[PDB]
Each structure stands twice: as C-alpha cells, then as structure tokens.
Amino acid sequence: MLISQRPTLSEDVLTDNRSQFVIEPLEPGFGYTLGNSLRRTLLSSIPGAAVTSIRIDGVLHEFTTVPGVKEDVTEIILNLKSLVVSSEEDEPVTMYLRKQGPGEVTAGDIVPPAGVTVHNPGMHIATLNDKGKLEVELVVERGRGYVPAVQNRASGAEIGRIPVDSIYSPVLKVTYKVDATRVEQRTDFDKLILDVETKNSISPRDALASAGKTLVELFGLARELNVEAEGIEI
Amino acid sequence: LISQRPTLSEDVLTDNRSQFVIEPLEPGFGYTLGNSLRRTLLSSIPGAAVTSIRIDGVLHEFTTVPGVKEDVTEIILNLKSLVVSSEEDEPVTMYLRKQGPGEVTAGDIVPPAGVTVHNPGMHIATLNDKGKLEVELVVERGRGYVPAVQNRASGAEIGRIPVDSIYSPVLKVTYKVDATRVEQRTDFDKLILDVETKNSISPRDALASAGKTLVELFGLARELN
Amino acid sequence: WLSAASFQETTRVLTDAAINCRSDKLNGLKENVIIGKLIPAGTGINRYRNIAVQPTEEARAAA
Amino acid sequence: NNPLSGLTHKRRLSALGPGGLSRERAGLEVRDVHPSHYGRMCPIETPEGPNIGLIGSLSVYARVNPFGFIETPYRKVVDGVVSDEIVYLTADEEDRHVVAQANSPIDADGRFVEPRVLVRRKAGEVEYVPSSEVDYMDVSPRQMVSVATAMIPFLEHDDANRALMGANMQRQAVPLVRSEAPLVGTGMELRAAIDAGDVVVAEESGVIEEVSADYITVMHDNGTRRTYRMRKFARSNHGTCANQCPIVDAGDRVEAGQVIADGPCTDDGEMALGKNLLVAIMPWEGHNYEDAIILSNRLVEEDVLTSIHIEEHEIDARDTKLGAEEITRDIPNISDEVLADLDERGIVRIGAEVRDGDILVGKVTPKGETELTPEERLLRAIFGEKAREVRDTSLKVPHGESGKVIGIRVFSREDEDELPAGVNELVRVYVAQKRKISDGDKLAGRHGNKGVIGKILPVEDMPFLADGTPVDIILNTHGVPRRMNIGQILETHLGWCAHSGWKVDAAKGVPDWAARLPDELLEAQPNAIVSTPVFDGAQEAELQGLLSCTLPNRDGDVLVDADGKAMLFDGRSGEPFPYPVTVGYMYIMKLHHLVDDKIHARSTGPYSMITQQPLGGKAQFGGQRFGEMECWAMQAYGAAYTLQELLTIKSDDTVGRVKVYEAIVKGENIPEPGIPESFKVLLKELQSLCLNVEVLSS
Amino acid sequence: QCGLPKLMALELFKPFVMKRLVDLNHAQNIKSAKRMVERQRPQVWDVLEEVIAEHPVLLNRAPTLHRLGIQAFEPMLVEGKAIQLHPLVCEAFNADFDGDQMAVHLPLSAEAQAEARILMLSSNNILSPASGRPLAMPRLDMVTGLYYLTTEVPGDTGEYQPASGDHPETGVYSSPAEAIMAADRGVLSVRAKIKVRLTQLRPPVEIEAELFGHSGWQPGDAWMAETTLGRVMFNELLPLGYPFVNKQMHKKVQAAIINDLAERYPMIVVAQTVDKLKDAGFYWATRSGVTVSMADVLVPPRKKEILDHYEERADKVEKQFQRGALNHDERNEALVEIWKEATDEVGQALREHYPDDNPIITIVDSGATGNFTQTRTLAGMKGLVTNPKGEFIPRPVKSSFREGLTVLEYFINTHGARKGLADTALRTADSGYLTRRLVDVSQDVIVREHDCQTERGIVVELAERAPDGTLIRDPYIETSAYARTLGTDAVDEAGNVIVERGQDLGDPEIDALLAAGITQVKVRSVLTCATSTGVCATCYGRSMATGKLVDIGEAVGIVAAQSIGEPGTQLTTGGLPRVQELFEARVPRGKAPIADVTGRVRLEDGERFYKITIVPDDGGEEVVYDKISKRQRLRVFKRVLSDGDHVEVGQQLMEGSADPHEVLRVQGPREVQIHLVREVQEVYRAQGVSIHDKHIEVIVRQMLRRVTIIDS
Amino acid sequence: GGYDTPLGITNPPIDELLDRVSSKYALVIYAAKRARQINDYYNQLGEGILEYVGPLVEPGLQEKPLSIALREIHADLLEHTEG
Amino acid sequence: NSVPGAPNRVSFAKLREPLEV
Ligand SMILES: [Mg+2]
Ligand SMILES: [Zn+2]
Question: To which protein family does this belong (chain D)?
Fold first, then answer.
C-alpha cells in the first residue's frame, strides 16, 4: 500500500563525531518499532577493534601502582580502554609502547603494526618522572558489541596478563525518542529522533547505513519465505 | 564471538499456530527483534472484512427482523466473527437468503467467486415458521481496524448499515528467547516466535508480509549510503 | 460603604451610609472591581499604566 | 440507568420533604449512624454529596411494622441452643434483649463452642457474654447491609467510605450491549434481577410454543396459552436503552418464576452491570497517573464497552393569534439536500441518519411581516425573493450530537388524541447513538476505585503475558494502599482463579485450608462463576490455596505464580519487565459520566433580561461562572486588564460586546471597555429604595 | 502546555478562525464562514492550528483556593473531548483525575494576552506563594520512580570489589556510555555501587576542593565518582553546573534540590529541569515493580502473644472494677490506655518484621503516599474506633482488614467513617467563609513604595543558646526568619559587622549569623511599616513566590488571605474553630487570667474556685482574681507553679488560652502581635502546614489599626 | 545561557526580558502597548502611514503582534518612560 | 437455589441461613 507520504531522514551534526537523525513520518506506532531495533542494532552489530588484555613490566601482584609513573594502574587501564583502534586482521595483534626518563606518555608514542591504526595519538595516558621507564604490552582484536573481561587462559605463561573489558562497538552512546508531530490533519503519525555518539574512527552516517544494511539483510532473510507478499511501500 | 549467519526455520503445530525459529542472534537482540515482528504482525497485515450490510425488512440497526429470534444488533455482533479471504480489491457483495424453521449459520451464505468464507459452521441467527432472512454483505480489503464509515460519507441509501471493519488475519503473536550466555563469549540468542492466525492466511505468509513491510522502512534507512 | 454593603449586613450598612450621607472615593480594589474600572494593583497603578514606548533611533534607521 | 438503580430508588429512606428536617436544618447528630440502625437501614449505602446521611436504604431483611416502625428478623436461643423460630423485632424490644452474632461457631446442635460470645447489649454497646445468657441471634450475615452494597465482593476487606463510594457507583453504571455476568460476585444478583422487575418471568409453568425477537408464547398445562410481549430499544428516563432479549429455546419447558427473557443489565437472569477485564496493577508511563485508567484498543474494537443512548426531541404545533403553525416540509429559504431526509409529512424519515444543525421537524409558524429593512427589499428586488410571509421555528437537533432515528410518534386532535388546550399537533422524535468507549469517560470497579480514561492504547503496545495475551486494562498501584480497598485485589486474585479453573489434589486427603472449604468447590472448570457472600466470604487462606493449583490454560504453562503475580513483556521496548506484577480479572463498569455529556464551549450566545449576563447550563448556550474566588485570584496575580475584560466586555457592557465582536472580526485591537449594565441596574435599584445615590465627576 | 479539545477550541476561537479563514479565501463572506464552522468542514481544522499558534488560554478549577488555582497555558488541539493537563500542575490545582472537570477562559486583547503569557504562565509559577516550597515537585509516581532509580543496593549485580593476588578490582567503568553498555547486558545492575569516571558533572564541593584545587572546572576535566549508575543518570538530568549529589533521593531531598535550583538558577532552566525530572520519574516508575497482592501484606508472628498479654491485662482491670474499687470512667480510661499500648506494640512488631524492600514500605518510606498508621490498619490491627459521641469504645477491633472483619467490627468502623465524612463537608464551607472574611478585611494593604525608611522593627530569637553553651537551631526559622530584611546591623561583641542592614537574610546570612554566634536579630516587618497607605516593599520583604524582593504594586493582602485560607480543609479548642476565634478576637472558652503587675503570687484553694492575688514589689496595690473554675489546671513557667513564686507583669497564671484584649491592654501592642502570630502559627503547624509569618503579620496589622477614644 | 532552545510561547526567555525592564507589570504594559502599535500599523498600512512604525525585527510567517513585540524587547529595540 | 432457572453459582459460604431474602 501507499504510506501517503515519503518517510525521510534528516541528519544534523552536533560535534565532529555526533549526530541527530530524524525519521519522519511513520505509520502510527512504528516509531518504537523502528527506534528500539535501531538502537540495539547500532549498539551491538557494528564490527570494530578493541583492547582485550594488558601486560606491563614492573607489576606482578602489586595491583596498586607501578614504579616511575605517578598515577596508578586503574587509571592507566582506563586510559588504555578509552583508546580507539581500528584493525583489519582478525587475529589478536600485539602492540608495544616504551619510554624512558621523565615525560608525558601519550598514544602517539605507540608503534602500531601494519594493518592497524590508532585514531587519536594525541591522548594523554601517563606521566613518568625520576628516571621513569614504562613499557606496556597491548592486545588488540576485532569483534562486535561490548564484552566483559574474559579470564585469561595463559595465567601461568603470562602472569602479568590482565584482561580488560572490550568496547568493540565504534558507536559509543545511542539514545532515541518518539514524538507525535502533525497528528490532526495527518491522522496521527509520529516522528523518531536518534542521538548518536561514536568514536572518531567512524562517522554516525555510515554507522547508520551499516545498521540499516544489517537490519535489511536480517529481515530479508526472514521475508524470503513467500516472495509474493503484500506490505506497504514508501 | 559468533560470526555465522542468522537463519530461519518453521515448525507447524496446528493448521493456524506455527513456530518460527531464528538463530543465531546477537546477545540481547532476540527480545527486540521478536517485539518488532510482533508489533508489525499484530497491526499492519492487510486482510479483508465486511464493512456494510443490508437487510430488506429493516432500516437501521436498532430494529428487529420479524420472525427471527435474533435481533439486528446481535446479528451484527454475531456476524462480526466472520473470517474471509478476498482476492479482488474492489467492494464485493455476497448474499444470504433463508426461509422456514431453522438456524442460519455462515455456511448458508453464497459468496461470489474469488472470495472465501472460512467458518461455515459459525452461528448467525435462528428463525421460525414466520422467519425469513435476506441480507447482503459488502466486503472490502484493507488493514488494521477502521470504524464505521458514515452513511452520508458515501452515496448510501437509507437501508445501508455501516459496520466496523477489522482487517487483521493475525490472532495472537508471542515469542521467547533462549540465551546461552557462556563464559567463552560464544553467546547468542535463539528467538522462538509463535504466531496464530484466524484460519485466513498461513502464519508463514503473515510473517512474509510483515517482513516485506519492515524491509521497506529499513531499506529507506540503509540507502543513505 | 459600597465595599461594606457588598461584604455583609447590607441593609444595616446601607441604612447607616444613607443616614450619614457617606461618600465613597471609589479608590478601593473591591469597588473598582464592582464598578468596572481598573483595580489599583499590579498593572492598574499609574506608574505601570502610563509608561510610553517608542522605537530606538538606531533600530528605526535600520528599518 | 439499570435495574439496580430502579430497585435502589425504591426501598430508599429519605429524610427531607414536608414534615421533616431539611438540608438547611440538618444536624451532625442526625447525620450520624445510630446503633439502632443495625438491620434497619444500611450505614454504607448513602449519597455522598451535601445530603450525606439524610438518605439511606432499607436493610435487605428489613420490614415495616403496622405502625411505621422498621423491624428486622432474628432467631432466638433457648438453653444456649439456637431454635429455628424467627421473630421480627423492633428497636424498642431489642434493648430489652441481648442479640448474638450471625457468624458464630455453631455446633450443628445449637451450642456455641466458646462460652463468651461477642454481642450487642441494651445501650448499643458490644461486649462478651456467657453463651447461656444470650436470648437472640442474627438471622444471617449481610443483615446490616443494603441491596446494592450486598453486591460488593470482599466487602469486609474494604474501608467504609470506599465501600460507600462503590455502592453509590453501582447504581450509575450504564447498560452495555452485552452485560456479561461477573466472574466473581455474591448470591444477591439473582434475587436483585428477579425483584427489580426488569426480567420477564414465567408466571405459569408450561412448555414454550414459539419464540421470536419480540414475543414469547408459552403453552400452559391447563389448556390456556400466554404471550409475553418483549420491549425493545425503549428509552428510559435517563436516555439509556432498555432492550430485552429472550434466553429460551423453542421446545424447553419452564417453571413458574423462571426467567424467560433477560433485560438491560442482566445475563441469564442475574444482574450484570459491567464486564470482566484482564487487569494489571502496575504504573505505566504516567498515563495512569493519579487515578487515571489505561485500556487496550480491543475494548473499542470488540464493542466490549459500548452503549446505546436514545434521545427524544419534542415540538408542538399550536394555535396562535395570527392563525396556526403547521408542520410541513415546505419551509422558506432552505436548501434541498437538507430536505432529502424529510418526507412529505414534514418529519425526518425513520432510519435517516442525522447530525448537528439538521432539521428533524419542519414546523413553520405564521408571523406575517415585520419591519422590512431596506436591504431585504433590495434583495427580493435584485434576485426575485418572494413574500416568504411565514417564519421557520423548525425543530433542529441540539448542538453536539448525531446518530440514527429510531421512530416517531405523532399526536393530533383530528385523530381524537387528547392534547393540551391550544396545541393541535405534537411530534416526538427519537434519536440513537451507539456511543463507543473513549477517553474522558468514567470507569469504576465495585470497590470505589473510579477513574477517567487517560489514554486508549493500541493493542500491540500493551503489556502481554508470556502466552501473548495482552492485558485489557491498567490501573495505578499507588491508589490501593492509600485508600484501604485491598478487597479489589482479593477480587482480582479470585477472578483470575475463576477464569483459569482449578483442581485441589486430594491425593492424601484434602489440605488443611480446604478442610472447611465446601465440597463441589474443590474442582472448577475454566471460566467458572463463583459467589462470595459479603461476610461469609472466601478466606485468604482458601484464596491462596486456590491460587496454588490453577490448572494451565492451553499448553503446560502457569502464567500466574503462587503469590498471584505474573511476568509481563513490555509491548513498546520488548524487554521483559524486571519484576512480576499482579494480573487478574476484575469487574469494570462504565458509569454515566460520559465526556460527550460534559463538554461545553461558548463564544457568544443568549443573555438574561434583567441583567445582561450570559446564561448558564448546557440547556441554554452556557457561559462559565467567574466567581468571587476567581476575582480574588486575578487580583492576587496583580493582573488588572484581564479582570476588566472578564467583567466588562464579556458579560455586561452591551456596546462593548458588539464593538469587541466587530473589532475582532475586522482585525483591529480591542476597544476600551465601558460601564457594566449590572452596575446601572444596581444604581436604579438603590434609587428605587428612596436612596439619593449619584456619581460625582469632580 | 495544555491539550485542548479541537471541537471546543473551534467553538471558543470562532471569530478568530472565521476571520482567518475568510482571509485564506476558503469562504467568501462571514455567512459562508459561519456555515462551514457549523458543519465543521475539513478546511477549518488546518487553519485552526494556525490561529491557535501561541495564543494563551487560562484554565481554572473550582474551588480556587489560592492564586495558583488559575493558570495560563499554550494550547494544542487534540482528538477527543477532554482537556489534557501536565501532571505537575495537579498539586497546584488540587486536581485528581477521579472525574473532576475544569473550566477554561480565553483572553482577548493585547493587555490580557500579555498578562496571561507573562504573569500566569505555569512555567512562571513553580514556588508556592504561601511558603515558598516548590509546587511543581515530582508527585507520587515520579518520586517512586526516582527513589527506585537512586537507591543503592548492597551486594547487587555488578558491584565494585577491590581484589589482589588473583585478579584486580574488576568493577570500575571508564565512562557512562560503557556503564549503560554493561547495563544492557546482565553484568551490571542500575542500582549497583561502582566507581565510574565522570567528565561533565561537577563534583561535590568537598572532592572538588580537595582534588581540583581552586579551579574546579569539571566539564573539561574528569574524576572518579564512587556512586551508582542511577545517580549518574539523575545528575545528568540536572543542569550541567549543578554539583553531583550522590545520595538516595527522598521527597524531602528532591524538595531541597529543586528549591536550591530555583534559588540560584533562572526560571526557564528550573522549569526545564523539573520537566526532565518528571519524564525520567515516569519512565522509571514502571520498572520499580511496585505492585500489591495478598503476599505483599504481611502479619507479625508475635501478634497473638501481644493480643493475649493485653487481653489478660483487660481481664484483670475488668475484675478489679467488678470488685467495685473503681468506677466506669476509670475502667474506660484503663481499657483505652492498655489498648493504646497494644496498638503501639503491634505496630512496632510489624515495623521490625517488615522488609525494607517491599512495595508498601517502599511507597511509605519514599515520601510519596500514606503512612505507617495506614499500613498498620491494613496489615496488623485497626485499633481504637470512635464513639459517635467522639469517645473511644472499650472493645476495639482486634483484627485488621487483611483478615477480614466481623459484621459488628465493620459497624463501629462505619460509625467513625461517617462522622469524619460529615465533618469534612462542614469544614469546607467553614474554611470558605473564613477566607472570604479574611480577603475582605485584608484587601486594603498593597505594596506602594520601595522603602518607607523606618528604623523600628521586630526582634526574632534565631536559634537561642543552650545551658551547656552552643547554638541549637530554632525549629521554626523558615517561617519566621527567612525572606525578611534586616532592620539593624548585626554585630558580635561590638566587633565586625556580619550582615549589613537592608539585606535579604537568606541561608548564607543566617549561617553567618550562627557562625558569629548572635541570636537575637532585629528585622523589618509590615507591623511597623510607616507608609500611610499600604506598606513599602522592604518592610514586607522578599516575596515568597518569586524568590526576589516584592514588586511595587503587588496586592499582598489578598495573597496573605488566600495563603491562610487555603489549608483550612486540613485542620482537625484546637482547630479551625480555634483559628477562627483567634482571627475574630473573641473571649476564648478556656479564659486564663493574666497577671497585671510584676509581683509575688499568693494562692488560696477556695471551694471549687481558687483565689490568686498578685502583690506588686513596690507601693502599688494588691490585685486579686477570684471567679475561676477548679477544672482548669495550673500553668507552668520558668518548672512548676508554686505559691509565693514571684511572677512577672504578664505571666499567664493559669494554663489554657489567654484573652487577646487583656494581653493587649496589659502588655502593649507588640506583645499581642507576638501572641496572635505565635498562636495561629502553632495551630497551623500542629497539623503539618507551613505558612510564612508575614501573612499573619499583615492580617494582625490590619486588625490593630484603630484606636478607642476615651475623652471627647 | 545554560538552558536549551525554548519552545513556543516562552521563546524569549522570561528572565532575559526581566533584566531589561523594572518589573513584571512594566514588562506586561511594555508588550501590550507595542502590540497595540504594531496591530494599528498592520491594519492601517494601506492608508497614510502615521507615527506607528511596523515591526523592527522580521516578523515570522504568521506571527502574533505580541510575540513580535516581545522579540523586539529582547533585541533591545525600544525604550520606555515610566509613569 | 430455590429459583427454577438459576445458573449454578458455587459459593464460599460456610453457614446455612434459616430464612430466604
Ligand atoms: Mg477529584
Ligand atoms: Zn516600610
């Protein structure tokens, strides 16, 4: 059937990587149907790379701090978690970062192997002083969604290996809200509003395109049961 | 950490009830997928229904046909439970004529070709020796629930009786999920979706229509490129 | 006396006012209400009712 | 509105009128509940407004002595053994006796198990007494209660004032199109429906010869046959349908006193004022905030809550000084489409649907001619307008309703019909509306839990059990504990149990709770009907045990767990609700407070004569009352100009009214208000009382 | 905003819409326009929205108890016949959705429209004019939802626990985005105590000072917050500059934070913040799982032991009476006292048994509805029920509603319920009459100038000292001290001036005064204003509704009258008759004589009538008081009443209620002002209603305006 | 400036209007008089233009004179003399 | 039931009343 008007998307950027999308207008009651599925798909379908485990020399069981750098280990694990990476190869890549003497440890001092990138080298990580010598080993792998830290099987081999939670999803925070603009003359349709914040690795537009693609493929896998079907058309 | 493709299967329980299995899915995706499919199945699956009727001996809903134990309003209410399938979109008329002592059901109505009445045993009214029932039903396609279109809205005569229309072959849709949630992160959701329709369309085809519906909106979403 | 008569004991108040030839200044809020002029409160005060507004000359030139 | 309302208007005790105290005279001691009321006049059923306590209802067992004194039955106990002898006792002799309690632990022989029993003594006091000293006992529970209140399940679990509200709303429920019998009730509905006179009863036993939608003929044993005519779609005094429907077959025999045809609010011969709705008692998105109610859209679709509202309109053709008004379809300066529904007689055809502003009766009156303005002469000159000597005071449907036309009655003197002197033709027109349930309409339970409809929700966006059945109605949970009507929740649990059926497993005897539970109740089929007498009701332990064994619905699934709750799926986001919420079946009734009868708006209408104030009420065109309290609030805001406009150019200043209407239509700013006409009326009034009052300008 | 029925809106705006639609040429003349209005043709609905666009319309509910009972709104057209309200203004309107109807008026001219959209906009009236406490507060559902979201559950899923030797703390989150990502899975519960890193919300003052030093700019920087995720969401709801709260939010806590917002933030932002709070409260009330059943209401096991103990006590007292040693009044008093003790013990047992997680206790504790007495009558036992004479029946209802009631048990309860239901109906009319008289007497006083430049005023105690030596806070300071103007400078031991004259005297000012240690403070009121007509702005002080100094045309008399008269339906001589007699200045029933001169007392216990003489400590004559009843007790002072105790000039020698005329004539006008204000304020506060002293001050000043001529 | 974009009737924030005028009543009469002048100009535009000048700010598509006037007040385009 | 056409209505009443309404 005909929806009597073309539902459309209107996107406005707010920051460099943050957007608001407006889908308008849908059939009555379809705002929630689209919005919740879109939110979940955005959060848990976009593939991306993330840090999984960290190993740093100088700590074996003293889980309080590490010598030289004044800030402690939980701070450093948080800075490392909030580090955006993009990996092309599925196998777990291992990165290293070392500095000597007093200084400011950023992400730019890291050396990424071929096929992997770090999308914000100018991020503060640590502060060394007093002949400080920091060496950090990193494990980066690609997945999807958000996954809690997984207990390391190589505890005996790598005692200093501490697993961390993985933010695989390039999109950080997506929220949505429905509204009922233009009800009376237009027999009570509704509009859907999305606010999407992602990492600087990818934009919100292409993330939305990928999410729409994934939902199209899923629901087409569902639909490819009776090819002749009657629905509604744009 | 599953990258294998999602897939679908069907399991028929009755002629109407059926159980569609979707697996594997992202953790937490099963509930929202089932909810979206349910909200579409229960709301926007086109069907056909009677919209207006007419009895020769009456002029409005609040009268009584002489001879039949039933009332006109309660005849309308009983006829509300008719299940039909149409193939031609335009308004189509079907006739029901009975006379003499007996009980008139939905099997006594002669439909024209290209439409089907699916519960011929359902009761409509009960007549006597003086009973005589002659009714004409006008049946249209559509979707969702549409209240009675006013008599003056169309070029309708005095005797036409507009009736509420409910084009919805879907009777009852629900779902459940089975989540593995294992330690090695090979966790997926198996979505079980059971659909029951009112004997008019296979739940397989109702799902096909719902999926074709959703595909249009999400294709509009994706084409942003 | 208008206020008092509208308040209570209207016959007594009217009789006393008529005997004493009392005069109402019509300056009270209740009597202003009852006769239908602006009450002497809020936007009914002179300093708020007689403000004059005119465009500023830069805006008028920019028009 | 219903047989309950009729039966409660009868058997009612007022305290006003000539020879008695009035509302201006009522004392609090009069309004109080005297201890002598027990079994004479109900202490719960009474109007709630200013006349609280001056109107009550006879107790269900009450009787009137030959001298006008209310007396009530009671059994007598001799030797501490209760006889079967029943004596009627007036409040005079009750003080000279010690009457025991209805629900006392009788021993199937006459003796009570405990020596000290709780009774009422002479001075209305309640105390404990050795069993061998009492001399009277209550005939039954519910002796102290009215007929309407006795239809409230779990009454003892409800607070007094909330039960009062429930009993007062029992008699305002409109008659729906189906009137399904409640799943849980009391035994009083059968007798109430029988004695209300709204249900046809077989006065002589016999077979049923033939049945139609209007008449039922019965073949009696002794050769004679009887015909009961059945009234259909007759408008009651309050504009509600009074349809009657047969419930019998063409060959079945009936006994004397059996129900033959059910009435407006009855099912199978027992009173049914509402519908059983599947209810959840969780708060939802704030649409059920502060006693609001949410419903599924299937209640609109399936006509679960819908009503027929029949309205009558009257117009009379009467003689006058200039001749006689005539009802005729010829009516001057009218179009043709609006005349299509008018027959040659001049009255709308039966069955022709009508809407606001249309003509029902074309009645034209002899006026002759008046001051013909120059413009009328110019118009009849320019186009050719004729004399049109007559005026059209035709019957038009009042503003704000529509619907079909049922029937017409026409009275005239030429047909011998007796009419008021001066009137030669009378016409009444009956219009029906099949009013569906909508927001703003008032719903209520039987426990005083009323509320308007905040929002009608699509069937997809409702909490649904794991089976997939959506809930029908949602009520807020903050309204129960504050008002102490837990009895409605007890009713919810018992309603779910009665809807699902049950079977107590008597594998090794009956469980402890079911030891005193009656037989034939250990096992109930799905959709059973149960009766809970008001005070000899279903105990909490019995209800809990019933909820334990609640045999599954279609497949093996116990949706409702041991404690009466269930797990719901949110129909909007899909995720399961974090905690189980209680669900059940509750009896919900639609009260006669429909928003269609309570919506008013006015821009400009009639005005009174002595003072030019607008009229008041929906009968006239209305106009809201801006009172002294509203004036105080306006002064408190310091807002003066809007007060001036609310008093002058909206109510009294006539030139101001006309000028403001002209200014608003033309598009210029509102003019300065003048002097209200009511003040000038007061000035002339005071002047006519020999008071030299004047206005001084300097 | 307010949702308006489209049909009724069309009828209301009829000339406007007809003119606009003839402008749009949909009709040629107004006759055609009127016809299409009557037939409601589709070309009118679309133009109706255009005409309705931001045209203020003011709603009202009868009775209009206070100024906020009628408020302006911007309307929208809705399908249906019911007016849709914002749930927040329901407290201001005293409007439930049980069936109550509402009226609507439309301002026509430019002046009326401007007044509606400025003075009476709902978003412009949050605080109550009577007491200043916010009236747009989250009510029942919203407080339930926010309490549920904010409470911290120990030992919940996803908590934070430090660890070493095998694994790290494994409970710390980098960002709220990661926190909600985890909350989507089952790993983290919303009410789980965790440590997160916050980058936007401003830290509380203590951690801010101890961590960021002087410059505490939070939105740029980051810090570790030891809190729960729900509190993070709530602080995110609040404006950006507001410090992090990190505390479970009871109704009082919400009142404090909203009052602080209105104090030091713009009106638009407080309105938007309150709207966001309502939205989240409604979203999270549904998830709190607040529900009821038989299993929810619980009964204490010790109930039968308690009832047996008190039944044995009743039996022993009954036998002691049956011996004739005591009369019926003594028996009834003993029975009532033992049954009060029984109710106390059973209520304590239920309190100590009930879990703190149950829905009923949650609702009662969160400050939304009800109270523990309501819960005790529900589950437990109802207890004593009133005589139709108001007395107490010796045998009370032993069971409660959960177990059901006996036929006679319901009867006694009906006695009490009908008594109350009639008395409230009488009370409403009585309160209406009272406020009607008050507005008429007090309508004269309106603010006329900025300053009358007087120097006399009123002494306020402001948290009197203690014998040990400390400043214990005065219980009633918001009523008496807040929102006033200093009449004289505040000094400590002739040292530094703490707060200067003509100051608003808010929270910082009172805190500075208490820090300096001074208590008695001279403040400026309407009692001493020297303005010939009305009062000056400074003497009246800060207007309680807007949080700023009163305006120069405000009719404060009507505001005071409405403020006093509005809670009149809540009162339950010691009630509404008491306040009525105080305002009407009649001889009190319990007339207690007062001394006339500072001197020594002498009491003789006469036959059923005492004899009290005051001997002045100087050459004055001795005054006597003879005709007094023996029923009344003796007033305490200093301690106790003692013969030969030297008493002051105006000491109340007998307990009861003194006469306003006598106290005036024997201690001047200031003392009678103190007495009247304190008496009315205590009568109101004994029920739980807070009303600022300035309203009663205005009405008392209007009382004392006249003078009686003694010589020609 | 910590608020978001105001919606509808409160489009010019009330406080940002309050700091431009002495009191709420003064602001009310401000806006009322300006709306009177603007409506007079609109009605009389076809004839000889009197002293009343039209809206100094650009009026919206279909905007009320009161809304236009309040926008004018917020933009600091008029001056007032107290009475 | 004492009414010929009464539908069955199972009851929780424990005691038997002596006289009918
Ligand atoms: Mg109400
Ligand atoms: Zn002063």
Answer: Belongs to the RNA polymerase beta chain family.
**Method used to solve the structure:** cryo-EM
Quick one: tokens of D492? Answer: 């919810």
Residues in E touching F60 (Cβ below 8 Å)? none
Angstrom distances, CA of residue E257 to CA of B195, E133, E239, E252, E265: 50, 11, 12, 9, 11
CA-nearest of D221, D187, D190 to D203 is: D221
CA–CA distance, C55 with F56 (Å, rounded to integer): 8
A154, two tokens: 């190589």
* Domain range summary for chain A, segments of one domain joined by +: 1-47+169-234, 48-168
| Cβ-contact B46, A1 below 8 angstroms | yes
End-to-end Cα spacing for chain B: 27
d(CA E517, CA E498): 10
Q: Which fold has domain A48-168?
A: RNA Polymerase Alpha Subunit; Chain A, domain 2 (2.170.120)
Tell me the ligand closest to E449's alpha carbon: 2
* Contact of E535 with E556, CB cutoff 8 Å: yes
Q: Which residues are registered as beta bridge partners of A197?
A: A18, A173
Sign of the C-alpha dihedral, residues B201, B203, B205, B210? positive
Going by beta carbons, is chain F in contact with chain C, meaning 3 or more pairs sit under 8 Å apart? yes
- The span from the CA of E459 to the CA of E461, in Å, is 7
- Tell the residue number behind the tokens 């979706």, with chain if given: B193
Architecture label for domain E141-286: Orthogonal Bundle (1.10)
Q: How far apart are CA D205 and CA E400, in angstroms?
A: 49
Q: How far is E687 from chain D (nearest CA, A)?
A: 19
* Chain-chain contact of A45 with B26 (C-beta, under 8 angstroms): yes
Do B47-167 and B1-46+168-225 fall under one CATH topology? no
> B35 vs chain D: nearest CA distance in angstroms?
5
Output the CA torsion B1→B5→B6→B11 (10° steps): -120
Class for domain B1-46+168-225, per CATH? alpha beta
**Chain E: residue whose CA lies nearest to C45:** E553
CB pairs under 8 A between B and D: 102
Give the resolution in Å.
3.2
Ligand nearest to the CA of E101: 1
Which positions ≥6 away from E475 have C-beta within 8 Å? none
Interface test with D, best of G1, G3, G8, G16 (most D CBs within 10 A): G3
Q: What is the CATH number of domain E294-422?
A: 1.10.132.30
For residue F20, how many other CB atoms are within 10 A of its CB? 16
For an interface test with D, the pick among A26, A27, A30, A32 (most D C-beta atoms closer than 10 Å) comes out as A32
Helix (H) or strand (E) holding E237: helix E229-237
Distance CA D551, CA D496 (A): 11
All chains having 3 or more CB pairs closer than 8 angstroms to chain C: D, E, F
Q: Is domain B47-167 annotated with CATH 3.40.309.10?
A: no
Return the CA Rg of chain A: 23
Beta strands in D249-351 (DSSP E): 253-254, 259-262, 266-267, 270-271, 275-280, 293-296, 306-320, 323-324, 326-327
- How far is residue D190's CA from residue D280's CA, in Å, rounded to a whole number? 29
Whether F contacts E, i.e. 3 or more CB pairs less than 8 A apart, is yes
Phi, psi values for residue D208, rounded to 5° = -110, 120
Q: How far apart are CA B206 and CA D597, in angstroms?
A: 42
Break chain F into its structural domains and give their ranges. Answer: 1-83
Q: E444 exposed, middle or buried (CB, 10 Å; 0-12, 13-18, 19+)? A: middle
Please answer whether residues E42 and E26 qualify as being in contact, where contact means their C-beta atoms are separated by less than 8 angstroms: no
Q: Which residues lie across from A94 on neighbouring strands?
A: A139
Q: What is the CATH number of domain A1-47+169-234?
A: 3.30.1360.10
